[PDB]
Ligand binder design. Structure first.
Ligand SMILES: Cc1ccc(N)cc1C(=O)N[C@H](C)c1cccc2ccccc12
Ligand SMILES: [Zn+2]
Ligand SMILES: [Zn+2]
Ligand SMILES: [Zn+2]
Length: 316
């Protein structure tokens, strides 16, 4: 027969585009392997007449594409582009209204934890290492958070509709973020074992679970040791742009100006709903696209984010 063709660009990072010309009789998958058009798995679709001139994502099918894929994503998972494109299929259809000067997400596909995670990220000082994450991190702040949410799902190994934790989401996100000007020096005192200090760097430096009160963490908290005496572990040195305090959900009161932002969890284990409290001239309860404000807050808090720059204790 006769061969018809159109001109289309393929890419893995949407920065370096490689030009291709494809037979319109054969499907995309035969010519490139799996192929996507803005999240549409067009692997089994023959090229159309309107497709000419557009840009499609392909898998890293040669080392030039593999290197470009790493330099933008810092991942070598062959599934990453497919998982990212599957997430982008749903996130591009979500709505991202500007609530209280922050880019929130209107509820859909069980994105409650992603919304309060998105709002939290807009208030803490964080540098993402993958250029895909930073670029999309940037574009979320401007109001276009479709790719950022899709990459968050991709990097956290979560899928659309699947339920997840904000505390476990931020942990994954902190792995893929530059936290090296970050150091926590814990010191533990036991009546029998004696005294020993630890130096935590990276994710463990900014995260702790057991109590929401960062002031209480400064006084000291109770932990066991090799014998069974509840020892006192207290913060000594903290150098990080922020700290995340966590604890299983319980009634907790928040005050005007004493914190940065919080995570509200209501309901059963896993089957609950997330809401975001942020500390402003007053307290704001951002629930997806919904917004209510109050001067006091006592409710089911599980994560509290505090601003820090550098801290050294006065406890001898
Ligand atoms: C939404 C979700 C998805 C996956 C996983 N693994 C957990 C959760 C989740 O609900 N976590 C919350 C915050 C939670 C944490 C710690 C103790 C809790 C006890 C009771 C109820 C909730 C508790
Ligand atoms: Zn190679
Ligand atoms: Zn959906
Ligand atoms: Zn001991």
């Amino acid at each position: 027969a006769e061969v018809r063709t159109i001109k289309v660009f393929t890419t893995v990072d949407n920065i370096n585009l490689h030009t291709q010309v494809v037979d319109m009789s054969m499907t995309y998958g035969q010519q490139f392997g799996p192929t996507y058009l803005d999240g549409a798995d067009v692997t089994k679709i023959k090229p159309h007449n309107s497709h000419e001139g557009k840009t499609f994502y392909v898998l890293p099918n040669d080392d030039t594409l593999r290197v470009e894929a790493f330099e933008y994503y810092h991942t070598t998972d062959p599934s990453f582009l497919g998982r990212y494109m599957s997430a982008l299929n749903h996130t591009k259809k979500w709505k991202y209204p500007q609530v209280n000067g922050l880019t929130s997400i209107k509820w859909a596909d069980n994105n409650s934890y992603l919304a309060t995670a998105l709002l939290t990220l807009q208030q803490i000082e964080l540098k993402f290492n993958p250029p895909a994450l930073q670029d999309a991190y940037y574009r979320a702040r401007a109001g276009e958070a479709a790719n950022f949410c899709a990459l968050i799902l991709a990097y956290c190994n979560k899928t659309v509709g699947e339920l997840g934790d904000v505390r476990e989401t931020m942990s994954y996100l902190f792995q893929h973020a530059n936290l090296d000007s970050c150091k926590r020096v814990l010191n533990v005192v036991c009546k029998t074992c004696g005294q020993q200090q630890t130096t935590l760097k990276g994710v463990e430096a900014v995260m702790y679970m057991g109590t929401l009160s960062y002031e209480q963490f400064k006084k000291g908290v109770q932990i066991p040791c090799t014998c069974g005496k509840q020892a006192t572990k207290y913060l000594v040195q903290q150098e990080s742009p922020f700290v995340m305090m966590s604890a299983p959900p319980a009634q907790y009161e928040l005050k005007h100006g004493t914190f940065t932002c919080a995570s509200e969890y209501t309901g059963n284990y896993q089957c609950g709903h997330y809401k975001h409290i942020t500390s402003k001239e007053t307290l704001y309860c951002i629930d997806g696209a919904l917004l209510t404000k109050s001067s006091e807050y006592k409710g089911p808090i599980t994560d509290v984010f505090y601003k820090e720059n550098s801290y050294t204790t006065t406890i001898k």
